[PDB]
Amino acid sequence: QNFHPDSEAAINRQINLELYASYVYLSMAYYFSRDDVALNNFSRYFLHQSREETEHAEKLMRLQNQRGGRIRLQDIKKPEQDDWESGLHAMECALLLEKNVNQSLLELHALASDKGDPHLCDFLETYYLNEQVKSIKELGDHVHNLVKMGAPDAGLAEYLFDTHTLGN
Amino acid sequence: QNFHPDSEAAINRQINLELYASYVYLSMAYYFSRDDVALNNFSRYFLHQSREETEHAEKLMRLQNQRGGRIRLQDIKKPEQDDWESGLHAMECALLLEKNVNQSLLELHALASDKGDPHLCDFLETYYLNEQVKSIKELGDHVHNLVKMGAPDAGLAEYLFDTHTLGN
Amino acid sequence: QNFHPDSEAAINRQINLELYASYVYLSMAYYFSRDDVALNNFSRYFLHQSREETEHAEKLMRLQNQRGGRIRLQDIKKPEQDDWESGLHAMECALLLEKNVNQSLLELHALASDKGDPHLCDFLETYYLNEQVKSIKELGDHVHNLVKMGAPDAGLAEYLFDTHTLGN
Amino acid sequence: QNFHPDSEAAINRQINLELYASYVYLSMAYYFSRDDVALNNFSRYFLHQSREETEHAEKLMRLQNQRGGRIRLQDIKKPEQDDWESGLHAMECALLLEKNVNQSLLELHALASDKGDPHLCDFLETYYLNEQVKSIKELGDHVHNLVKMGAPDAGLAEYLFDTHTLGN
Amino acid sequence: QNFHPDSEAAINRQINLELYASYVYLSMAYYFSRDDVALNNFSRYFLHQSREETEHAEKLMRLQNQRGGRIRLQDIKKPEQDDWESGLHAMECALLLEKNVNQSLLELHALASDKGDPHLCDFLETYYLNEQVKSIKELGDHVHNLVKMGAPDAGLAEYLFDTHTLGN
Amino acid sequence: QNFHPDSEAAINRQINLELYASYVYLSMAYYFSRDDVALNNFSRYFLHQSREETEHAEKLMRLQNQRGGRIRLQDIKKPEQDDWESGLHAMECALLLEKNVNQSLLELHALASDKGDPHLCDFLETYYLNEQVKSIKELGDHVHNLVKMGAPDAGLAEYLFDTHTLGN
Amino acid sequence: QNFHPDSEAAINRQINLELYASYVYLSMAYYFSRDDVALNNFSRYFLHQSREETEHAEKLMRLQNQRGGRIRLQDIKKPEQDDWESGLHAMECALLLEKNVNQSLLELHALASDKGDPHLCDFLETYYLNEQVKSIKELGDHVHNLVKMGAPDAGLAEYLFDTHTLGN
Ligand SMILES: [Cl-]
Ligand SMILES: [Cl-]
Ligand SMILES: [Cl-]
Ligand SMILES: [Cl-]
Ligand SMILES: [Cl-]
Ligand SMILES: [Cl-]
Ligand SMILES: [Cl-]
Ligand SMILES: [Cl-]
Ligand SMILES: [Cl-]
Ligand SMILES: [Cl-]
Ligand SMILES: [Cl-]
Ligand SMILES: [Cl-]
Ligand SMILES: [Cl-]
Ligand SMILES: [Cl-]
Ligand SMILES: [Cl-]
Ligand SMILES: [Cl-]
Ligand SMILES: [Cl-]
Ligand SMILES: [Cl-]
Ligand SMILES: [Cl-]
Ligand SMILES: [Cl-]
Ligand SMILES: [Cl-]
Ligand SMILES: [Cl-]
Ligand SMILES: [Cl-]
Ligand SMILES: [Cl-]
Ligand SMILES: [Cl-]
Ligand SMILES: [Cl-]
Ligand SMILES: [Cl-]
Ligand SMILES: [Cl-]
Ligand SMILES: [Cl-]
Ligand SMILES: [Cl-]
Ligand SMILES: [Cl-]
Ligand SMILES: [Cl-]
Ligand SMILES: [Cl-]
Ligand SMILES: [Cl-]
Ligand SMILES: [Cl-]
Ligand SMILES: [Cl-]
Ligand SMILES: [Cl-]
Ligand SMILES: [Cl-]
Ligand SMILES: [Cl-]
Ligand SMILES: [Cl-]
Ligand SMILES: [Cl-]
Ligand SMILES: [Cl-]
Ligand SMILES: [Cl-]
Ligand SMILES: [Cl-]
Ligand SMILES: [Fe+3]
Ligand SMILES: [Fe+3]
Ligand SMILES: [Fe+3]
Ligand SMILES: [Fe+3]
Ligand SMILES: [Fe+3]
Ligand SMILES: [Fe+3]
Ligand SMILES: [Fe+3]
Ligand SMILES: [Fe+3]
Ligand SMILES: [Fe+3]
Ligand SMILES: [Fe+3]
Ligand SMILES: [Fe+3]
Ligand SMILES: [Fe+3]
Ligand SMILES: [Fe+3]
Ligand SMILES: [Fe+3]
Ligand SMILES: [Fe+3]
Ligand SMILES: [Fe+3]
Ligand SMILES: [Fe+3]
Ligand SMILES: [Fe+3]
Ligand SMILES: [Fe+3]
Ligand SMILES: [Fe+3]
Ligand SMILES: [Fe+3]
Ligand SMILES: [Fe+3]
Ligand SMILES: [Mg+2]
Ligand SMILES: [Mg+2]
Ligand SMILES: [Mg+2]
Ligand SMILES: [Mg+2]
Ligand SMILES: [Mg+2]
Ligand SMILES: [Mg+2]
Ligand SMILES: [Mg+2]
Ligand SMILES: [Mg+2]
Ligand SMILES: [Mg+2]
Ligand SMILES: [Mg+2]
Ligand SMILES: [Mg+2]
Ligand SMILES: [Mg+2]
Ligand SMILES: [Mg+2]
Ligand SMILES: [Mg+2]
Ligand SMILES: [Mg+2]
Ligand SMILES: [Mg+2]
Ligand SMILES: [Mg+2]
Ligand SMILES: [Mg+2]
Ligand SMILES: [Mg+2]
Ligand SMILES: [Mg+2]
Ligand SMILES: [Mg+2]
Ligand SMILES: [Mg+2]
Ligand SMILES: [Mg+2]
Ligand SMILES: [Mg+2]
Ligand SMILES: [Mg+2]
Ligand SMILES: [Mg+2]
Ligand SMILES: [Mg+2]
Ligand SMILES: [Mg+2]
Ligand SMILES: [Mg+2]
Ligand SMILES: [Mg+2]
Ligand SMILES: [Mg+2]
Ligand SMILES: [Mg+2]
Ligand SMILES: [Mg+2]
Ligand SMILES: [Mg+2]
Ligand SMILES: [Mg+2]
Ligand SMILES: [Mg+2]
Ligand SMILES: [Mg+2]
Ligand SMILES: [Mg+2]
Ligand SMILES: [Mg+2]
Ligand SMILES: [Mg+2]
Ligand SMILES: [Mg+2]
Ligand SMILES: [Mg+2]
Ligand SMILES: [Mg+2]
Ligand SMILES: [Mg+2]
Ligand SMILES: [Mg+2]
Ligand SMILES: [Mg+2]
Ligand SMILES: [Mg+2]
Ligand SMILES: [Mg+2]
Ligand SMILES: [Mg+2]
Ligand SMILES: [Mg+2]
Ligand SMILES: [Mg+2]
Ligand SMILES: [Mg+2]
Ligand SMILES: [Mg+2]
Ligand SMILES: [Mg+2]
Ligand SMILES: [Mg+2]
Ligand SMILES: [Mg+2]
Ligand SMILES: [Mg+2]
Ligand SMILES: [Mg+2]
Ligand SMILES: [Mg+2]
Ligand SMILES: [Mg+2]
Ligand SMILES: [Mg+2]
Ligand SMILES: [Mg+2]
């Protein structure tokens, strides 16, 4: 009922993108626990973000089932980098990733609106759009502090951010 | 991202209006604790409403920060009256104030819809539009009871409403 | 009784100044939670100061009611700046604000003394004058530490002050 | 030390006035428990006020002892009325009594100031002057509500005030 | 019913005498806390007796109300002395006072008997006559011990009685 | 702000006097624990007074810091006596010391009043002037009892005062 | 018994030196709470050291009493500086002070040994000599860390030491 095939396909594309974001964050988590990086709270922060993105994917899979769509999985592409360079660079990449995921969600909302699917619009507004705004704000805050503190070249900056902001 | 400058400005106008509503309610609270009014539960009721309106303003300020807008504060105008005349008159003025704030919020929602900003639309629907409906209903209930009871001329009406309805 | 009209008017002016100080601190709080400032404990510190200044205003409104004066509210002017530049600059501005509020309170005390109003003199001494001294001392301490640490140009100074002194 | 004989005598006069105020309130308490008045919460309210005035007298007696003065007691005059007429009239008389006690305390403060006795000035400001302001405000509130409600001629007014405001 | 006007008047006289006894004991309490007397347990003992005498007065006022009499208050005369000389002398004066109050109560009982008022007779027997006997016995015990111990001239006597008997 | 250099200097003189009073009481405490005096509760009483005087000094040092004055310490002179002769003599000396400290505080209050420094006036009234009155009263009480009991020549007097009044 | 007059005098000199050390530390404590120093944990650290030195003085006074010597107090000289310059300088001065107190205690031990006073030797070894060693070690540790960190010129050094080492 009232579930357009274009919407089914776009949900499937969004599932893949959430799974990709999970993998990017998993890659970052294990970069920060290398013996030549060793920022354990950066590692834990990105591991938590990876697990949140898996939940984002699962909620969309549940939506497909609830609405009678067919889940169609695709390969989860590897992250663009295996070496994330620094805590600052990884935060900047995460910020760009979250902005790109947000744009995809806003395009999905525009499609649902065009198709007169208020249930899908509300689902996105309730579980996705504000979550993306808060995540982009948080990552922007982190980038700003790391830049101001002198990261990555100032030797104390990433260490102190790891211990204070990401320690909690 | 997807935050229109017209929306930024309208949010700033709404912040000011919420702060104005706070000040109106603060003025009313301290009118009801005058030695020649002395309706302590009217006073407490309006003081609580004043504090709620401050929270309404703060949430919009947080939204501006989250979305990357610039908060631009303006003078908070004094309330139209320093003498609120009676418990009935203050309730009628509060009802008109809340209706005017509601109209401003509905205009802000219409602008956000025109600009294709579902995050802002959802923010208003989630935190503002139903809150305004419930507040207008509550104040309308209070006005009706005070009118029926004979306020302000019937000497027992405002006293009994203060002790029973606004006592809790 | 023994409440001079000059004192009534000066109390009304002081109410407005306390409300203005509240607004200044509210503005500062939301500056520090911008995505390009992101000093969350500076933000919380100034938000708490804003709420304290509202209480200062309310106590003076209660005094007006208790003494039989008429509260006369005025517009609450916007703060002089929307961009507070740095944690150091905001602290320096808060220090100057508190010194100006203190001077106004001392002028109010001098007027109450001239009018032979010991109740008003005692009210100011009990709730205002020592509070102002302690606040000026605290803000002076903060300015000194931020200056010594190298704020705002030394990239670690404001971050470390935020995490250690204003974290608690 | 620094205790002027004029101050000793004025303290003794104030002790007598506090004891007189106690007796007035005791008289009122037992008027309201007459079988042809029967307002038990008016009775309890004035009995509590009577006991507070005894404490006011005792604190001044302690001050005389602490400062090395000699307590000189005088007759406690009977109250002006044995029939207090109504709840409204008794409240109006209590308001006038408290205003007269306040004027006496302000005259005592002026004398202590003239004699350069800051300890006595502070004693009065700490324990007496604000207490008098709050008591005058409270009694003024009660008078206003009783007048508005139609007391003493409106048969429900004093009964309802007794049950609601003075019940607590 | 069965309440004779002579009984009403005699109750009013007894109320005044109980209030007078309260004042005598209050005077004694504050004599013992002078810096040149400084017997703090004598002070506390007489303060407690003062408060008991107020209760004796209030019970008679309640009786007047219960029986439909009219309370008619009179001035409360000051105590005969402001300087009570010694702990022994104050105890001897209290003993004489209680004997005089007892004689007045026995005269009141004789009047109630003559008027055939068993309720008043029982009231006096239940709340007053045995209380007076016990108080006279207690004060006689105290006088005897103070005399035997050498008061007031033996420098340790009043001090030791204060610390042991009146300490508790 | 509003802190006169004469006031700064007078506060520094008062700090020294409080420290001197501490030292006097320390000397007395250790006199009473000599093997040829052996009044352990006199010793504890004066040791407690010594520690209170240190707190009096510290509060004035904090005030100097809070107001932006410069603490200027001076030598703490030794007490006038190393042999305090008796419990009575030590109490009489403490009484004279507290009277002299009180006179200095009243002179400091007069200076603060002349300089229009209500914060300093209130500080002294709140923390010092009543504390001095109560201390002078307490020591006067102790002197009176010791004199009446026959101290120092009556062999039981100081022993019994030590065990009863200063035991607690 | 076995208490040499040279030992009595040397104990009296040591009492004075302990009291002097207390005063030095008190001065330092209130330097660190100036509005232009504002290192609150340096302040608390030195205040605690001041109170420990008072206890050191009191134990020697108790020893004099226990052994039958006569306590002879002398003026407590003011500290050499009122401006302690920096956290590093104050620590260096405290280290030198503790070394000088230690030398005095070792000279006192040598005298007690020469006089064949094993009780005094044991008293010093039990309560003083190891305490001095530990205090000198602790202050040396603090000096070393402050020097290495760049104090006083490196703007973060004293602030970070205050928050981490002296915070606890
Ligand atoms: Cl499912
Ligand atoms: Cl695929
Ligand atoms: Cl790469
Ligand atoms: Cl990089
Ligand atoms: Cl880059
Ligand atoms: Cl770094
Ligand atoms: Cl925010
Ligand atoms: Cl404006
Ligand atoms: Cl108007
Ligand atoms: Cl109206
Ligand atoms: Cl109308
Ligand atoms: Cl009404
Ligand atoms: Cl009702
Ligand atoms: Cl109010
Ligand atoms: Cl205006
Ligand atoms: Cl600006
Ligand atoms: Cl700046
Ligand atoms: Cl600047
Ligand atoms: Cl910085
Ligand atoms: Cl007393
Ligand atoms: Cl008289
Ligand atoms: Cl009358
Ligand atoms: Cl009437
Ligand atoms: Cl009338
Ligand atoms: Cl009525
Ligand atoms: Cl009810
Ligand atoms: Cl009754
Ligand atoms: Cl009379
Ligand atoms: Cl007499
Ligand atoms: Cl006698
Ligand atoms: Cl006699
Ligand atoms: Cl005696
Ligand atoms: Cl301080
Ligand atoms: Cl000196
Ligand atoms: Cl001497
Ligand atoms: Cl002597
Ligand atoms: Cl003498
Ligand atoms: Cl003795
Ligand atoms: Cl000892
Ligand atoms: Cl000397
Ligand atoms: Cl120097
Ligand atoms: Cl230095
Ligand atoms: Cl150096
Ligand atoms: Cl440093
Ligand atoms: Fe999470
Ligand atoms: Fe996601
Ligand atoms: Fe995400
Ligand atoms: Fe609420
Ligand atoms: Fe609102
Ligand atoms: Fe509203
Ligand atoms: Fe009711
Ligand atoms: Fe606070
Ligand atoms: Fe304020
Ligand atoms: Fe302030
Ligand atoms: Fe009360
Ligand atoms: Fe009173
Ligand atoms: Fe009163
Ligand atoms: Fe009793
Ligand atoms: Fe009695
Ligand atoms: Fe009696
Ligand atoms: Fe104490
Ligand atoms: Fe003192
Ligand atoms: Fe003292
Ligand atoms: Fe310790
Ligand atoms: Fe030491
Ligand atoms: Fe030491
Ligand atoms: Mg997929
Ligand atoms: Mg997250
Ligand atoms: Mg590939
Ligand atoms: Mg690739
Ligand atoms: Mg919608
Ligand atoms: Mg919704
Ligand atoms: Mg939501
Ligand atoms: Mg969401
Ligand atoms: Mg997220
Ligand atoms: Mg951050
Ligand atoms: Mg605004
Ligand atoms: Mg509400
Ligand atoms: Mg206008
Ligand atoms: Mg207007
Ligand atoms: Mg909702
Ligand atoms: Mg809502
Ligand atoms: Mg509402
Ligand atoms: Mg209603
Ligand atoms: Mg205003
Ligand atoms: Mg504050
Ligand atoms: Mg303007
Ligand atoms: Mg402006
Ligand atoms: Mg105070
Ligand atoms: Mg204050
Ligand atoms: Mg403050
Ligand atoms: Mg600080
Ligand atoms: Mg009197
Ligand atoms: Mg009361
Ligand atoms: Mg008369
Ligand atoms: Mg009369
Ligand atoms: Mg004053
Ligand atoms: Mg005061
Ligand atoms: Mg007060
Ligand atoms: Mg008061
Ligand atoms: Mg009162
Ligand atoms: Mg009322
Ligand atoms: Mg009477
Ligand atoms: Mg008794
Ligand atoms: Mg007479
Ligand atoms: Mg007489
Ligand atoms: Mg019986
Ligand atoms: Mg009985
Ligand atoms: Mg009795
Ligand atoms: Mg006995
Ligand atoms: Mg000094
Ligand atoms: Mg004391
Ligand atoms: Mg000398
Ligand atoms: Mg000397
Ligand atoms: Mg006080
Ligand atoms: Mg005091
Ligand atoms: Mg004291
Ligand atoms: Mg005593
Ligand atoms: Mg010495
Ligand atoms: Mg130590
Ligand atoms: Mg010198
Ligand atoms: Mg020197
Ligand atoms: Mg050995
Ligand atoms: Mg050993
Ligand atoms: Mg050992
Ligand atoms: Mg040791
Ligand atoms: Mg040590
Ligand atoms: Mg260390």
Author numbering:
A (entry chain A), B (entry chain A), C (entry chain A), D (entry chain A), E (entry chain A), F (entry chain A), ...: 10 to 177
Sentences from the paper on this structure:
Ferritins play a crucial role in iron homeostasis and detoxification in organisms from all kingdoms of life. They are composed of 24 α-helical subunits arranged around an interior cavity where an iron-containing mineral core can be reversibly stored. The ferroxidase center (FoC), an intrasubunit di-iron site, catalyzes the oxidation of two Fe2+ ions coupled to the two-electron reduction of either molecular oxygen or peroxide. Mitochondrial ferritins are atypical of those found in higher eukaryotes in that they are homopolymers in which all subunits contain both a ferroxidase center and a presumed but undefined core nucleation site.
Co-crystallization of FtMt with Fe2+ allowed the progress of the iron mineralization reaction to be studied by freezing crystals at defined time points following exposure to O2. Crystals frozen following soaking in O2-containing well solution for 2 min diffracted to a resolution of 1.48 Å. The main chain atoms of the model derived from these data overlaid those of the anaerobic structure above with RMSD of 0.13 Å (157 residues). The positions of the residues acting as ligands to the FoC were unchanged relative to the anaerobic structure. Metal ion occupancy at Fe1 of the FoC was somewhat higher, while that of Fe2 was decreased. While there was a small increase in the separation between Fe1 and Fe2 from 3.37 to 3.51 Å, this was not significant with respect to the estimated error in atomic coordinates. Strikingly, peroxide, the product of O2 reduction that is coupled to Fe2+ oxidation at the FoC19,32 was coordinated side on between the two metals (Fe–Fe μ-η2:η2 side-on coordination), Figure 3, in a similar fashion to that previously reported for crystals of FtMt aerobically exposed to ferrous ammonium sulfate for 3–5 min. Occupancy of Fe4 was decreased following 2 min exposure to O2, and sites Fe3A/3B remained occupied by Mg2+ ions. The only other peak in the Bijvoet-difference Fourier map corresponded to iron bound in the 4-fold channels.
